[PDB]
Amino acid sequence: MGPAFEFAVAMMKRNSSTVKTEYGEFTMLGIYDRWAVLPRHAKPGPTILMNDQEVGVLDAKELVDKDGTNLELTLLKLNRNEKFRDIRGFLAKEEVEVNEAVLAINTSKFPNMYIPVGQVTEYGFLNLGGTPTKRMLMYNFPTRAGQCGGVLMSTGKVLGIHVGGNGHQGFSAALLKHYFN
Amino acid sequence: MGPAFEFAVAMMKRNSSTVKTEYGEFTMLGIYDRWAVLPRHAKPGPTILMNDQEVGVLDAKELVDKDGTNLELTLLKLNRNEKFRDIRGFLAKEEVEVNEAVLAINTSKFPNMYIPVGQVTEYGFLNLGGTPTKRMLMYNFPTRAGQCGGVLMSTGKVLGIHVGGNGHQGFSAALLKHYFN
Ligand SMILES: *[C@@H](CC(=O)OCC)[C@H](C[C@H]1CCNC1=O)NC(=O)OC(C)(C)C
Numbered sequence: 079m080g081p082a083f084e085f086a087v088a089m090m091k092r093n094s095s096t097v098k099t100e101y102g103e104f105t106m107l108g109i110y111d112r113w114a115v116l117p118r119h120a121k122p123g124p125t126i127l128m129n130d131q132e133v134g135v136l137d138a139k140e141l142v143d144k145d146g147t148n149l150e151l152t153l154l155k156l157n158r159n160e161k162f163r164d165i166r167g168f169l170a171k172e173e174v175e176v177n178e179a180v181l182a183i184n185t186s187k188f189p190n191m192y193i194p195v196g197q198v199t200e201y202g203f204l205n206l207g208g209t210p211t212k213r214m215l216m217y218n219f220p221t222r223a224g225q226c227g228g229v230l231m232s233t234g235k236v237l238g239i240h241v242g243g244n245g246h247q248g249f250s251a252a253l254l255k256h257y258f259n
Numbered sequence: 260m261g262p263a264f265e266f267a268v269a270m271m272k273r274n275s276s277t278v279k280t281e282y283g284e285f286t287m288l289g290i291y292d293r294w295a296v297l298p299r300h301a302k303p304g305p306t307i308l309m310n311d312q313e314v315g316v317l318d319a320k321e322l323v324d325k326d327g328t329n330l331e332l333t334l335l336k337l338n339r340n341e342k343f344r345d346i347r348g349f350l351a352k353e354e355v356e357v358n359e360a361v362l363a364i365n366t367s368k369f370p371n372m373y374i375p376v377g378q379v380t381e382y383g384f385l386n387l388g389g390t391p392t393k394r395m396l397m398y399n400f401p402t403r404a405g406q407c408g409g410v411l412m413s414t415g416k417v418l419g420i421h422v423g424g425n426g427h428q429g430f431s432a433a434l435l436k437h438y439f440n
Pocket residue numbers: 102103104119206207221222223224225226227240241242243244245248
């Protein structure tokens with residue numbers, strides 16, 4: 079997992095930030111340009127705090143599969159001038175599976191923390207607190223609140239954004255290339 | 260840091276447990292035999308919870324330097340029959356310094372989480388919340404409550420037990436070979 083931790087730390091350091099909305103505090107991954115992603119339930123309003131600074135949200139796309147099913151991700155274009163390193167070549171065309179994965183969190187509650195969640199298996203369909211959601215990854219880990227938005231990774235790969243959990247299972251929304259231009 | 264994460268995960272998995280006292284919930288490192296260590300302020304009573312199970316505390320040694328100065332560590336002999344893998348060869352004779360270190364936490368609040376704290380420099384003397392304490396290591400990291408007992412590590416080395424913090428600095432009590440037989 080060392081290589082995965084090493085890739086995780088460098089990714090987080092480069093593309094991640096702590097975001098506060100009216101719905102809580104989240105890890106946020108900058109993707110390319112001024113587009114970043116949050117778990118849908120961050121329900122970002124018209125303005126956000128990004129590393130303690132009021133940032134304007136130009137546009138917000140709450141993603142759904144072609145059948146309308148919830149995928150649980152919001153894309154936000156950010157009213158700022160600095161551009162996010164482009165990490166789209168780190169995102170796959172389809173649900174990545176893996177045996178050693180790392181979940182990276184970066185808030186006031188979990189500042190730069192990393193969790194070896196181990197095995198990540200495409201889970202696909204899940205009733206995400208009453209909401210049928212697709213394209214889920216699952217790992218066995220006693221996840222906790224405060225962790226949403228967490229970035230799921232292995233060496234070389236950004237698998238997904240952490241969205242859900244119960245007890246000893248967490249779930250990430252798979253972060254796929256085509257959601258981005 | 261990968262090698263350090265890898266050593267950290269394996270150490271934690273082998274020698275660590277979550278401990279509850281009347282003073283809170285702590286990470287605990289089993290050293291050899293049935294002796295483990297906690298930060299002093301865990302002030303363990305006559306019985307402890309160890310991974311949710313009532314365990315009897317045979318003996319408790321709150322360590323001090325020869326001049327009585329606080330070192331901030333309690334050693335506890337545990338009323339159980341299973342023996343802790345002996346990790347004393349992982350503990351140094353003196354305050355280890357390093358450039359890439361990892362702090363491993365393992366409670367209900369931070370279950371199996373790892374933090375790359377980076378540079379660890381012998382700090383020695385610190386006024387640890389009104390208590391002059393010696394043999395401290397320091398790292399720059401925005402540490403948070405719930406983290407005490409955390410195990411501080413690099414590849415091949417167990418440096419210390421996390422005891423203190425303010426804002427962007429945490430402090431570990433150096434975990435030295437001779438505290439143990
Ligand atoms: C992640 C959201 C969160 O952590 O709140 C602020 C960052 C929640 C899932 C955690 C609960 C148990 N395991 C977890 O990782 N999800 C959440 O609060 O919302 C729904 C949509 C109900 C999952």
